[PDB]
Write a protein that binds this DNA or RNA. Structure first.
Ligand SMILES: [Mg+2]
Ligand SMILES: [Mg+2]
Ligand SMILES: [Mg+2]
Ligand SMILES: [Mg+2]
Ligand SMILES: [Mg+2]
Ligand SMILES: [Mg+2]
Ligand SMILES: [Mg+2]
Ligand SMILES: [Mg+2]
Ligand SMILES: [Mg+2]
Ligand SMILES: [Mg+2]
Ligand SMILES: [Mg+2]
Ligand SMILES: [Mg+2]
Ligand SMILES: [Mg+2]
Lengths: 258, 197, 140
RNA sequence: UCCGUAACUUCGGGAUAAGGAUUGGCUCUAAGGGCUGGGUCGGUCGCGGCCGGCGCCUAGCAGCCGACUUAGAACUGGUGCG
RNA sequence: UACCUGGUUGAUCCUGCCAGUAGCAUAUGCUUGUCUCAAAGAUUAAGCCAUGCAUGUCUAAGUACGCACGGCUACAGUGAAACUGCGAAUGGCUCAUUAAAUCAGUUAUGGUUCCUUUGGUCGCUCGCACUUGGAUAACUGUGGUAAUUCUAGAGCUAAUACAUGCCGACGGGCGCUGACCCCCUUCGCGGGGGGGAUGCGUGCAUUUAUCAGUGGUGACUCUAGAUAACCUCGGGCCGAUCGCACGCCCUGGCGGCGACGACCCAUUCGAACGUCUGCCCUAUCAACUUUCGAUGGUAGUCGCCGUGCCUACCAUGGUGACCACGGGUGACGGGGAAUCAGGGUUCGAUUCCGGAGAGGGAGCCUGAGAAACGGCUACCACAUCCAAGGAAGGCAGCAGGCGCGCAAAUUACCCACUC
RNA sequence: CGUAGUUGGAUCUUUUUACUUUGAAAAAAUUAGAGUGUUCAAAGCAGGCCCGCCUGGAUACCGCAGCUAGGAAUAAUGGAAUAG
């Protein structure tokens, strides 16, 4: 191309959006924002293909232009705003206050949280740098920036910020035994405690995570998101608590529910 | 136009490679600035990203550093005496990033005579032979201890011409900054100039 | 011990020389490669030495035997590998040459010894790697 | 001067094959040599030496001298230049 | 379904091919009641194209004095046009080019750019404002021309166009300078401790030199700090803008929310150039490359940056029977497709990803992004109007037509769905 | 005859690789395959149960190369002989 792409084909879309291949040729290419394109969830396919509030695309913008949708305490009107992990969608008219967290199969679950849980969120510390006059900064997995963070908060740690304030409330260090969620790869959505952070200089670091059944698995350090301190998750986990059943152990769960 | 691609080169083996696309715009090159000495003439080029880089076609005034006192003044360039890259850039008075230049020394004599009260390169009276109060006159006496410039560098102040060196890239930044040659780097370039004579 | 062979003055651009033994800039590279003694106490100037110059090691780290030592500060190593053919389910010996920058810190390298290289920013038309550790041959 | 040269052949030749470019003046720039001295402390008297403590040019400097030739560049002329 | 049968002899056992047999995909022949899906001018000609369409766009929120409509005193409210802004670099089509190239997996940018979006930052600088200047279009009025999305002359008039430019913060502080006062000694010389006027400088971004060693990295010549400065007139930043609701203090003085814009730092979408490994046939292609850069060194120039990218000065290298180099390809690459016991063989123009080109080449403008072709500028080829003076062109976009051929569809309706 | 190439006897507990196993990271579509009565089937990702409720949109495979941790038979290779 001579410049940046603007469309997105239907079959070339991300798998976890769960679009179908006979509705149209294209998929909603999400706008540029705080989340990556393969790691986001656009607002139109959340309101239309999950919640059934609208039936077409034009009925989504009739919701959004009436300013009924809030993201992170702020009104967003774009139908392809990239919403992502640990984000809070506040509809607030029906009073629902969603929080996007992956299920155990690796797609965004329609997950409801309590309307005082929607005051805050969690963020992974991606970068620490100082600025002019020696002022430290902090960059999250979202594109937001915090001036004057806590001196103990280092890279890959998880902070808890307040929406509508934008300041740091509390943080969790990346340590052994803390409670984390996997945000990428073949273990997308699984939850367990950190067993061992295996270091490799130059290349990627690998973290072994032990599930709450005895199962263990490993993932790169760039996909590990700490969600709890010790064994206590600081959010409300979805239905299943991040346990990946085998394909036999989810057959009988269907078979013992008929 | 002027392309700075790689695909017009032959391969490592010596095989001629065949082009697979027309020459793209991010592979452009532009003509050299060939910055001379004279009254200031600077052109700006719109470059990739919408940015601007300043290319200077004539420059007479620079910003050079004395180095061993952290004394940087804005002085005037007289001429070019040496160029390691091409001998015929000296004859046409072209200023490039490492060429050895020759500058007026009077901002460096004037600062030195004010910081040490000692004549430099002399065979008005107020800054040198001033009546100082004895607390102030005390302060100039520990500066008097370390006031000795090397013998190769006191020669330069008598002719009023320091031998200097460009450090910036004129024709990219539009300026000519650099530092004064001193020490073993001075006497290396001194005998190269004497050998060409 | 006399380095000034070129038309321009050779100096390490971080060491300020004229201050009122000259000091020697050298850095430590990562990944467990020890900076040799001759890079630390020697006097050579090289902006493409990974220890005393402007080369940062990042990316891949490879190995090969020295075959030619005839360019200035650049040798040719042959890394000799073994390619699989699925139809005949047998292997096939291929090789590949590489021009690699060799620093003066490795004093005596001979034709036929194991050289560990690490890649960096491109240094020439063909040179992308840089010698990090010289391991001699058997009986030497 | 610099390029470039076929058929054929007794492999020597064909061959200055054929074919093309360049050439002035002026101002510079490189490169190509030769003769001399590398003597550290008077240890100390027949401003010079007599035998040896006393030292490291040793990647060669420094002085003087000397032909002719090749290559490159800028300028310059009514495109003129073997 | 891991399969064979006929054919050399007078007869036999063989080697061996020819011929059957079964899919697959192109053409074609004869035939064809229903109904659900669905390829479809790739193969020859990346041949040439009549006509039409395929890219424009306005909110309460840049500029309305068009009565073009329109309600009751700068400006109601609609609003054509025009300026300004933004997009037009995506999509779509075709497969000619292209054989470590494209491409794929893998890594890097600690070797670079990045409109927008989102989040920071935006009184950190000591130095007419209750609003500054000029111009131009629409419009009106005179035209020219055979001609076109040609434009001329004259009179108006705007800004988030284009320029120009201040107050406030703002009390100073901090560095240097040092008049000067002051205290404790001293036989004295000397030595010691504060205050200090007057002058110079001061923030980010930029450019160079130097000093020291807040946070980070496997690794910095990283980030941050200190100092001396510089800062391009073809010029870095530091709001002369717009709308909602309008309150509050004593004419004045403050205040809620937005829009729009900003140098810079992140971020997002990427982009570009590198790392490693991987490609069909050919030796009736065995040596190729190199003072017309071939390999490397030093210094630069150019560039968004690393780099023989280019120049100067040097070195004589670099590649090859492990198949270089040269040639071919009925070669775009890949995901894939047909066949298939196990291995394989052949195909992949073709809806997804990546590349390329818009008749052939070449050069560019604008912009964040183009060497753009539903942008200009040439020349070659072709072709279109013409009053002969000139003017305009690019269907490998959708349809359609001609041609080429064994060979391929309607100049249909719609933005309702997808975006 | 002979250089490349290819291939190389036995031997030891009963240094670098190759190998083997595992982990990551690997675009969907297609293929394999799960669930589901498109009236069946090719398909499709839907659906199902009496104010709404319940539930799916699986898993595998993806040569080689590169990365990761176990294994140490086989196969290369390396240490002390002028002891330097
Ligand atoms: Mg096989
Ligand atoms: Mg003849
Ligand atoms: Mg018969
Ligand atoms: Mg047959
Ligand atoms: Mg396109
Ligand atoms: Mg990016
Ligand atoms: Mg062909
Ligand atoms: Mg193109
Ligand atoms: Mg055509
Ligand atoms: Mg073009
Ligand atoms: Mg067209
Ligand atoms: Mg047909
Ligand atoms: Mg054996």
């Amino acid at each position: 191309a001579r410049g940046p792409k603007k469309h997105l084909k239907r079959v070339a879309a991300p798998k976890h959006w769960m679009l179908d291949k006979l509705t149209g040729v294209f998929a909603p290419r999400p706008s540029t924002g705080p989340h990556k394109l393969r790691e986001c969830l656009p607002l139109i396919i959340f309101l239309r293909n999950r919640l059934k509030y609208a039936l077409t695309g034009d009925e989504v913008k009739k919701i959004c232009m009436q300013r009924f949708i809030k993201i992170d305490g702020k009104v967003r009107t774009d139908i392809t705003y990239p919403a992502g992990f640990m984000d809070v969608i506040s509809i607030d008219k029906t009073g629902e206050n969603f929080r996007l967290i992956y299920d155990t199969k690796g797609r965004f679950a329609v997950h409801r949280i309590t309307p005082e849980e929607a005051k805050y969120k969690l963020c992974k510390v991606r970068k620490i740098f100082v600025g002019t006059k020696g002022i430290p900064h902090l960059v999250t997995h979202d594109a937001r920036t915090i001036r004057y963070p806590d001196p103990l908060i280092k890279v890959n740690d998880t902070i808890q910020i307040d929406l509508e304030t934008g300041k740091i409330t509390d943080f969790i260090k990346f340590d052994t035994g803390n409670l984390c969620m996997v945000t990428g790869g073949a273990n997308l959505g699984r939850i367990g405690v950190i067993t061992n952070r295996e270091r490799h200089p130059g290349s990627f670091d690998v973290v072994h995570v032990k599930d709450a059944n005895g199962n263990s698995f490993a993932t790169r350090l760039s996909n590990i998101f700490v969600i709890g301190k010790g064994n206590k998750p600081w959010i409300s986990l979805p239905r299943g608590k991040g346990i990946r059943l085998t394909i036999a152990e989810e057959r009988d769960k269907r078979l013992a529910a008929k | 136009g002027i392309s700075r691609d790689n695909w017009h080169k032959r391969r490592k083996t010596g095989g001629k490679r065949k082009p697979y696309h027309k020459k793209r715009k991010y592979e452009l090159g532009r003509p050299a600035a060939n910055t001379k000495i004279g009254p200031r003439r600077i052109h700006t080029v719109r470059v990739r990203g919408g940015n601007k880089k300043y290319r200077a076609l004539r420059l007479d005034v620079g910003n050079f550093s004395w180095g061993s006192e952290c004394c940087t003044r804005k002085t005037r360039i007289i001429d070019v005496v040496y160029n390691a890259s091409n001998n015929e850039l000296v004859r046409t008075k072209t200023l490039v990033k490492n060429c050895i230049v020759l500058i007026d020394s009077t901002p460096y004599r004037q600062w030195y005579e004010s910081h040490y009260a000692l004549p430099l390169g002399r065979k008005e009276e107020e800054i040198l032979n001033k009546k100082r109060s004895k607390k102030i006159q005390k302060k100039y006496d520990e500066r008097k201890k370390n006031a000795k410039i090397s013998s190769l560098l006191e020669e330069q102040f008598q002719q009023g011409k320091l031998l200097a060196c460009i450090a910036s890239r004129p024709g990219q930044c539009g300026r000519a900054d650099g530092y004064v040659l001193e020490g073993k780097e001075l006497e290396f370039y001194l005998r190269k100039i004497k050998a060409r004579k | 011990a006399d380095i000034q062979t070129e038309r321009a003055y050779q100096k390490q651009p971080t060491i300020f020389q004229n201050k009122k033994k000259l000091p020697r800039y050298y850095k430590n590279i990562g990944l467990g490669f020890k900076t040799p003694k001759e890079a630390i106490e020697g006097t050579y100037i090289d902006k493409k030495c990974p220890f005393t110059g402007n080369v940062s090691i990042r990316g891949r780290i490879l190995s090969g035997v020295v075959t030619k030592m005839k360019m200035q500060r650049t040798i040719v190593i042959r890394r000799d590998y073994l390619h699989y053919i699925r139809k005949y389910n047998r292997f096939e010996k291929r090789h590949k040459n590489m021009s690699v920058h060799l620093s003066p810190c490795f004093r005596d390298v001979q034709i036929g010894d194991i050289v560990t290289v690490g890649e960096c920013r491109p240094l020439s038309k063909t040179v992308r790697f840089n010698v990090l550790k010289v391991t001699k041959a058997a009986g030497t």
